[PDB]
Design a protein around this ligand. Structure first.
Ligand SMILES: Cc1cn([C@H]2C[C@H](OP(=O)(O)O)[C@@H](COP(=O)(O)O)O2)c(=O)[nH]c1=O
Ligand SMILES: [Ca+2]
Length: 129
């Protein structure tokens, strides 16, 4: 896998964001995770967390996996990095997302994220409290 550039257009919620990629506006859905919807518990905090991560970042990158790059809704499916830090992993590690939607062939970072989730559960953070 490799990182490719992108720039923030707009924060959306815990696991979606509007980015410019190859000069086109795209909604991205973060691979292998599920945040609560904004109207759910830990939704607002998940959204804040991802927004803060985007807005503090000097450099946003996206990384496609080996499979499908777009979902059925036209959302880009990627791992996102903010200043080299994976937003998908940071959400899990903080108990603001669950590992989810692990489809065969787009699951390169599954075990990295499961390790983060096990630590968040251990610490009883947020979703796991
Ligand atoms: C994360 C992800 C979601 N999706 C689709 C499956 C789910 O379909 P349904 O909409 O039919 O439930 C939906 C979940 O995304 P959200 O959690 O953003 O709703 O997005 C994929 O197809 N591939 C993926 O990698
Ligand atoms: Ca969601």
């Amino acid at each position: 896998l490799h990182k490719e550039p992108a720039t923030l257009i707009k924060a959306i919620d815990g696991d979606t964001v509007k980015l410019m990629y190859k000069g086109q506006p795209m909604t991205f859905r973060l691979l292998l995770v599920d945040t609560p919807e904004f109207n759910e518990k830990y939704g607002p905090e998940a959204s804040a967390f991802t927004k803060k991560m985007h807005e503090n970042a000097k450099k946003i990158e996206v990384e496609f996996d080996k499979g499908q790059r777009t979902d059925k809704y036209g959302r880009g499916l990627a791992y996102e990095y903010a200043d080299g830090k994976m937003v998908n992993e940071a959400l899990v590690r903080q108990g603001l997302a669950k590992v989810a939607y692990v489809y065969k062939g787009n699951n390169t970072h599954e075990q990295l994220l499961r390790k983060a989730e096990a630590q968040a559960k251990k610490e009883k953070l947020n979703i796991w409290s």
